[PDB]
Amino acid sequence: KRILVVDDDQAMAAAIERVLKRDHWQVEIAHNGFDAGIKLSTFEPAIMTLDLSMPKLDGLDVIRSLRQNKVANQPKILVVSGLDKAKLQQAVTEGADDYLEKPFDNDALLDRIHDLVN
Amino acid sequence: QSKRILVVDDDQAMAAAIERVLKRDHWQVEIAHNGFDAGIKLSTFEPAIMTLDLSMPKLDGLDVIRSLRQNKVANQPKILVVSGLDKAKLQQAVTEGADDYLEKPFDNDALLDRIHDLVN
């Protein structure tokens, strides 16, 4: 029941955290790649939400590095789409498990999360 | 103690030149070009030393140092900060916990002196 939220947008990351805390999830937030990298084995989560509109983080390369470094505890990757769609389609192709598109409901978030583990 | 060094730098050529000097000096080297790879390799490779470039436009070296302190990572490497124009960022990195620094441009033997000083 551990969830890592990766987003540079602190207000959005906080808003995501609130909805997950209602649905009884333990949340950690990373605003950058390094912190996301560390928390992947320091917090050791089951699902990682990964925002694809981070100017200083490329989601594709996160997915790439995950499956090409033979990392243990490799979580389910829920990709959060926005401005781009070529990025989104090749993130799922690269190895994102499921996605959310802008805009998404709080229920659409939790149903995506529950479909990912069950 | 080990001979493992993680070189963190987005400049592929600078990271390759650092790696060449360390390899020739009998160190085992991995490279990360971005923060996520750096953070992943810190677990999977467990370096004794991490060299951290302060001129990475997508990585703030202060965030790396603070993330290591705040998450309380086991078996942390010693951090050699590699600094460019921003002198205030250099001093901030050192005060916040960087173990040593190296100012760019540097010679091969200046790199080696720092690396050897961290392990001695």
Q: DSSP assignment, residue B57?
A: T
CA-nearest of B49, B52, B48 to B65 is B52
Maximum Cα–Cα distance across chain A = 35
Distance from CA of B115 to the nearest CA of A (A): 23
Which residue of B37, B42, B58 is in closest CB contact with A56? B58
CB A74 within 8 A of CB A44: no
Number of helices (H), then strands (E), belonging to chain B: the values are: 5, 5
Minimal Cα distance from A54: which residue of B?
Answer: B58
What span, in angstroms and rounded, lies between the C-alpha atoms of A79 and A24? 21
CB B40 within 8 A of CB A37: yes
CB B55 within 8 A of CB B61: no
User: Does A39 sit within 8 Å of B36, measured CB to CB?
Assistant: no
What's the CATH code of the domain at B18? 3.40.50.2300
User: Which of B30, B40, B50, B56 to mutate to test binding with chain A, by most A CBs within 10 Å of its CB?
Assistant: B40
Distances (CA, A) of B37 to A61, B20, B107: 9, 20, 27
What span, in angstroms and rounded, lies between the C-alpha atoms of B112 and B27? 11
Query: How many residues can be counted in chain A?
Result: 118
User: Does B73 sit within 8 Å of A34, measured CB to CB?
Assistant: no
Residue B119 half-sphere exposure toward CB, CA atoms < 13 A: 14
Residue A49's CB is within 10 A of a number of other CB atoms, namely 25
Q: Which residues lie below 8 Å from residue B91, measured CB to CB, with a gap of 6+?
A: none
Distances (CA, A) of B104 to B55, B84, B97: 10, 6, 20
Q: Which residues lie below 8 Å from residue B28, measured CB to CB, with a gap of 6+?
A: B2, B3, B4, B5
Give all strands (DSSP E) within chain B, no chain letters: 4-8, 28-32, 49-53, 78-83, 100-103
* Contacts B42 to A, Cβ<8 Å: 37-38
DSSP bridge partners of A93? none
* Sign, CA torsion B84/B85/B86/B87: positive
Long-range Cβ contacts of B20-25 (<8 Å, 24+ apart): B21/B108, B21/B111, B21/B112, B22/B111, B22/B115, B25/B112, B25/B115
- At A46, is the secondary structure helix, strand, or coil? coil
Phi, psi of A8 (to 5 degrees): -75, -30
Question: What's the number of domains chain A is made of?
Answer: 1
* Contacts A65 to B, Cβ<8 Å: 34, 36-37, 40
Distance from CA of A33 to the nearest CA of B (A): 4
From the CA atom positions of chain A, what is the Rg in Å? Answer: 13
For B6: left if phi > 0, alpha if psi spans -120 to 50, otherwise beta; the answer is beta
Report which secondary-structure segment, H or E, holds A79. Answer: strand A76-80
Q: Which domain covers residue A100, as residue numbers?
A: 1-118
Distance from CA of B38 to the nearest CA of A (A): 6
**Degrees (nearest 5) of the Cα angle A23, A24, A29?**
95
From the CA atom positions of chain B, what is the Rg in Å? Answer: 13
* Contacts B36 to A, Cβ<8 Å: 33-34, 36-37, 57, 61-62, 65
Q: Which residues lie below 8 Å from residue A4, measured CB to CB, with a gap of 6+?
A: A27, A28, A29, A30, A36, A39, A40, A43, A45, A47, A48, A49, A75
